[PDB]
Amino acid sequence: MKYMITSKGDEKSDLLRLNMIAGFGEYDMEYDDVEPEIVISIGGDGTFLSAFHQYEERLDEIAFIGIHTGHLGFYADWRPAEADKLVKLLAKGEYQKVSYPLLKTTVKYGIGKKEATYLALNESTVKSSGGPFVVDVVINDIHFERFRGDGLCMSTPSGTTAYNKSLGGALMHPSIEAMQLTEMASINNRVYRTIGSPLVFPKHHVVSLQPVNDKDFQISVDHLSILHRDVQEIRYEVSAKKIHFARFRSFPFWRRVHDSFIED
Amino acid sequence: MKYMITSKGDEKSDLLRLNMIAGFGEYDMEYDDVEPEIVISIGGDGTFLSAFHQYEERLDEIAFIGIHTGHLGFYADWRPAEADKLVKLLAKGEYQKVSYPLLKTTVKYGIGKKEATYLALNESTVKSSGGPFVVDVVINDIHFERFRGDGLCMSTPSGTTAYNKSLGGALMHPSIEAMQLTEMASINNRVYRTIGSPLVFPKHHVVSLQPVNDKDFQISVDHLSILHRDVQEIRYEVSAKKIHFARFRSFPFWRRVHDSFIED
Amino acid sequence: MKYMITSKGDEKSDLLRLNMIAGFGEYDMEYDDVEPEIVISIGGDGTFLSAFHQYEERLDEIAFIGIHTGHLGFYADWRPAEADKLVKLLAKGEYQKVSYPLLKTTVKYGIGKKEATYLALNESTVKSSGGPFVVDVVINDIHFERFRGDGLCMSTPSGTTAYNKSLGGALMHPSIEAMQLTEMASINNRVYRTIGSPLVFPKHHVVSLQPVNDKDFQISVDHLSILHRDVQEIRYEVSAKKIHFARFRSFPFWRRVHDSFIED
Amino acid sequence: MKYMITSKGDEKSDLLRLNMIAGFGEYDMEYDDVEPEIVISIGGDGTFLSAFHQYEERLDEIAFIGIHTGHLGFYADWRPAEADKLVKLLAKGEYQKVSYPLLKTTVKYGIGKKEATYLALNESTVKSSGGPFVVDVVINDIHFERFRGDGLCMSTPSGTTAYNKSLGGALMHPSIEAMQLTEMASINNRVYRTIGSPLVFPKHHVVSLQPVNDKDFQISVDHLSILHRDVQEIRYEVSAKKIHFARFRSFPFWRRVHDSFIED
Ligand SMILES: NCCNC(=O)NC[C@H]1O[C@@H](n2c(C#CCN(CC(=O)O)C[C@H]3O[C@@H](n4cnc5c(N)ncnc54)[C@H](O)[C@@H]3O)nc3c(N)ncnc32)[C@H](O)[C@@H]1O
Numbered sequence A, B, C, D: 001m002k003y004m005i006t007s008k009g010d011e012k013s014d015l016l017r018l019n020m021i022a023g024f025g026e027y028d029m030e031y032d033d034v035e036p037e038i039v040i041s042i043g044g045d046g047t048f049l050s051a052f053h054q055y056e057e058r059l060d061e062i063a064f065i066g067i068h069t070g071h072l073g074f075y076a077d078w079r080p081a082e083a084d085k086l087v088k089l090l091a092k093g094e095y096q097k098v099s100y101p102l103l104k105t106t107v108k109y110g111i112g113k114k115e116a117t118y119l120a121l122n123e124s125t126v127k128s129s130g131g132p133f134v135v136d137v138v139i140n141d142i143h144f145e146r147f148r149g150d151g152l153c154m155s156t157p158s159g160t161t162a163y164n165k166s167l168g169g170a171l172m173h174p175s176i177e178a179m180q181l182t183e184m185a186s187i188n189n190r191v192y193r194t195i196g197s198p199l200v201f202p203k204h205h206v207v208s209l210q211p212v213n214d215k216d217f218q219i220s221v222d223h224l225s226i227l228h229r230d231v232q233e234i235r236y237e238v239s240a241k242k243i244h245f246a247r248f249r250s251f252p253f254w255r256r257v258h259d260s261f262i263e264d
């Protein structure tokens, strides 16, 4: 099938990529980075996230595979030593597809109420553009709390082991179609009150952040951080789109968590 | 329809119960506490939990309603001042049913591998029977961690605002069929390691706790705490059974959370 | 004695200031904002912090008093309704002085190893200037951990109820000469490890943060945030300097905490 | 000098003890377990804590040394391989003494207001004797909060790396004469409020726990857990007594923390 390979760009990843291209040349595999059906990422989770964003308009046509060339790689299923076995397995079509949920972020602006939308595989975060962060949190049009603090993080299931975890969030199995909102350093006193706890939302719930004073925010989507000025609303919901992985053997999520956080 | 009313048993709840029985006597409503179709709890969440356990063998035939006579009542939809409106609405059949997920706990023993099963509406917790608590946590037959600490808590979605919240768990919307495992004071050092984070499991995942040394445990299921001796395994999974509520007006979960924790 | 009054600058604080100046004119009190012996802050804790920094070179010659014109004011001992009683008490010399500890921050640079020093009443925080934050934490020349995450916060005792509290720090009575280091969203996995827990340091311990890759940092000292480029070291220690408060009646720290966080 | 050696009682610790007794027999060292001046503990921190409690009436006459025969031993300064070097160093008097603070717990009862006092090296904890735990927390006679939850923990500085750490407490250098109060699973909602944060108290502050309903409590002091009935008050303060360690080389507290929690 049509495939492409992205590389972190260090010597080890570049050479592994060239050797995999050579191995694929022995099968009916066409290198095509415009319309790949398989996208292989060689590097770390940063490389994988960049691969996802490179192809986020063709997610229903692509299955992703990650090779980790460091000690990490939550989205990675393969070690570099196994690349030749992976070339063979992929060239024979011997794989199942597994899908994880994604997060949709919509940013609405002032004069004209125009919108930008973003898809996240790990999370989308919001902070102030300098100065105090204060937003009203509105859940399905219900005013839920006024948040004062450093920022907020909305995670996908597979993102729950990333920034979300560092913020005290729950780790959620990716078969659950949900998003999880965590706080960054909320202020809580007799006058200012937030829920504190992480919140887990199902599909079709909408969480809107509404400015109270300042309308400028730094919004991240996975690695990408962007200053948005004149914001009227930031809206979070579980995307209808999913990312698909090519799976060749069992590697359960909870074993992946064990291997990344308990010991390997 | 057939109904019954449980009361906390203080003067206020007992009198409200008698006045509601009087009002129901003006409709085609039969008091029947053997096979009720509607169970009304007057008191607090403790009273509601006791009502649930009284009828846990007929959950598919019953819709529950809670009236709170104090300042609390997460499972309560009604204030005592509204009891006459509730009598009327219920007597006319003007309600929809909403279902929340439940937690199944199985305790397996020694000589004979016999089993006890329990259903929980809030949570099931495990602690040692005195002396150190150490269990292996096995997820779908994958050895995930060896837990050392005070205990573990497995929560339903609606239980996530209860003990789970105090332990740092996420609050989960009850449309999500899941259970959430939280730690109580885990020990973490260079030799002993746990995940720390709360874990959220979908339906059909099984979490087994397996003793390492001591086989005696104090196991709670909602308010009920029982010493179990000679335990071989404690198994948690999302139940196939659900609790059904009679709903007469919108009172969204997130508004309920707001009212209980942010302000009312 | 020589005094001055700073105001938040809204109508309520400005008018209270003018009325207090009028009342002081009935005693042997000279308004002097170059060498005051008493500095009165009318506003919130932000106003008080600004007053502290305005006079941080004459801290051994000044006693501070705060009036809070909102609902807040941890450093405030007086409500606006009591300003006339305060004018009288102050004009008669009827007060004791209480001292709180301060935090010294030293920032060392590249070409020339030049230094900037800062005093903090609440805390000093460090974050990256964009991009990843990674520092080595060195305690009394002992390499203690490599911190990866959003940032670090070093608090004074009286600052422990501020940013430190939101980050999970302990609240420390200000008779303890100490500083407290808290983490902001540390990453912890099989490869990256931090202590997690807040750390409390006595006087004479030195905590040095040493860059690992990027040498540019955003450093805050109380409200003031400054981009520092080409940083070689950030050094924290309990200052030899103290802030002095004029106290006219008992208002214990723990009662102040109760009133600010439990109820008033 | 007069010395004694306690052993964990496994083969490795018992044999090391016998070999150390043999080595001491080559110096002017008298084995005396009634009035030792040096107490050597061979085992783990549990063994060390038991040694401390065995001699808690002669703490001003004793210096303690711990050898750890497992992977642990926060109070241990020596590995078994170094026991012969320790015999020699101790027999020559080549050591300095370092002191850590201790916690005094006083339990007052009903009919007669009689008192029991306890000293703790790690911590003293309070839980209910079954059923709900509710106490008023009174600090220097100031009603500070009504605590509802699983229990409370009051730690010494050196105990801050023990149960206190698992409960989210700060780690405090033992040169600070203080105690630290942490919560176990407090309930917090619109009706029930606690501070949440750990609290650090200086010497001479008194923290009293006062029953609200049930008067029976399970009180731990280091490893020892005791049911106390008819309790009127539990009082915590930093002890005037200190534990003394014999130190033969530098092993800073923060390096000890690094070695126990970061890596060794
Ligand atoms: N993005 C700004 C978000 N911060 C606030 O809304 N701060 C105000 C609230 O904090 C209370 N407070 C202060 C103060 C003060 C004045 N600050 C604003 C200004 O100077 O303009 C500067 C301090 O902010 C704290 N800050 C920063 N970010 C967070 C965060 N995420 N969480 C919690 N605090 C945070 C740091 O401590 C700064 O040193 N001091 C105390 C005190 N010692 N004890 C109790 N309350 C106090 C004060 O009565 C008010 O209710």
Ligand SMILES: NCCNC(=O)NC[C@H]1O[C@@H](n2c(C#CCN(CC(=O)O)C[C@H]3O[C@@H](n4cnc5c(N)ncnc54)[C@H](O)[C@@H]3O)nc3c(N)ncnc32)[C@H](O)[C@@H]1O
Pocket (backbone or CB within 6 Å): B131, B132, B133, B148, B149, B150, B184, B185, B186, B187, B189, D044, D045, D046, D047, D049, D072, D073, D074, D075, D122, D123, D158, D159, D160, D161, D162, D163, D164, D166, D222, D223, D260
């Ligand atoms: N259900 C028992 C679960 N506790 C343990 O496994 N404790 C042993 C571990 O803790 C380390 N430790 C100690 C100690 C010690 C000896 N303890 C057992 C005995 O005496 O038989 C008593 C202490 O246990 C602590 N304990 C109780 N429950 C929890 C919990 N849930 N979480 C964390 N600790 C907990 C309390 O502190 C008691 O005062 N002292 C220190 C120290 N000062 N600094 C660092 N490590 C230390 C020690 O090197 C070992 O690795």
Ligand SMILES: NCCNC(=O)NC[C@H]1O[C@@H](n2c(C#CCN(CC(=O)O)C[C@H]3O[C@@H](n4cnc5c(N)ncnc54)[C@H](O)[C@@H]3O)nc3c(N)ncnc32)[C@H](O)[C@@H]1O
Pocket (backbone or CB within 6 Å): A044, A045, A046, A047, A049, A072, A073, A074, A075, A122, A123, A158, A159, A160, A161, A162, A163, A164, A166, A222, A223, A260, C131, C132, C133, C148, C149, C150, C184, C185, C186, C187, C189
């Ligand atoms: N100031 C940067 C600090 N962040 C890191 O060092 N991130 C790398 C570490 O996280 C692991 N990881 C990732 C990822 C990834 C790639 N990131 C860098 C890049 O793209 O260049 C972007 C993600 O960073 C996370 N990030 C940001 N700030 C914090 C923070 N304070 N704490 C914890 N994470 C934080 C957010 O999630 C971003 O979406 N994804 C996962 C995953 N899903 N599950 C487990 N591990 C994972 C990965 O294997 C590596 O070990």
Ligand SMILES: NCCNC(=O)NC[C@H]1O[C@@H](n2c(C#CCN(CC(=O)O)C[C@H]3O[C@@H](n4cnc5c(N)ncnc54)[C@H](O)[C@@H]3O)nc3c(N)ncnc32)[C@H](O)[C@@H]1O
Pocket (backbone or CB within 6 Å): B044, B045, B046, B047, B049, B072, B073, B074, B075, B122, B123, B158, B159, B160, B161, B162, B163, B164, B166, B222, B223, B260, D131, D132, D133, D148, D149, D150, D184, D185, D186, D187, D189
């Ligand atoms: N040592 C007892 C300490 N527990 C309480 O004071 N519980 C009552 C408070 O919790 C609220 N609540 C309930 C409930 C209920 C009835 N419980 C008493 C009885 O049945 O007699 C049993 C439940 O207690 C929870 N429990 C136990 N220990 C802790 C702890 N340390 N921290 C927090 N909760 C704790 C567990 O969940 C049990 O399943 N259910 C909910 C709910 N689903 N959502 C929100 N609030 C709720 C309720 O409105 C009230 O304000």
